Design a protein around this nucleic acid. Structure first.
Length: 61
RNA sequence: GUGUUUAUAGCCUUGUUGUAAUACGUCCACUGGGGACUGAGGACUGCGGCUUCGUGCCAAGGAUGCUGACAUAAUGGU
């Protein structure tokens, strides 16, 4: 029963309008700034994939 | 060209001028550099040399000291 129906729900929208992600979906339009890091003492194999993940997301550090 | 005997060169031989020098052989428990490989052992003993003596010092029963570079690298293996 947790499946969201295609018909818009006012309870679901009331929850989201002041949610943790509300600053992104509101008229404020908070530009997302990403911080990608790894685990401690990672190898170059992790960096070759992290660089690709860095290409996917602009404005990511 | 023929024969000469220091001539306006000198050569050799001989004793001989103050002695030598040099080369070769040999020796120094005399000495100054360059290069390479090794560092086994692992408290102390020992034999020695310095030292007035030294919990002294030393090249004396086997390497120590001073540095520099790297973790996303350096180094080696398959």
């Amino acid at each position: 029963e947790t499946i969201i129906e295609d018909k818009p729900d006012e309870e679901l929208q009331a929850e989201l309008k002041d949610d943790e992600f509300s600053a992104y979906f509101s008229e404020e339009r908070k530009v997302p700034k990403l911080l990608v890091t790894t685990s401690k003492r990672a190898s170059r194999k992790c960096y070759d994939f992290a660089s690709e993940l860095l290409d996917c997301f602009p404005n990511a550090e």
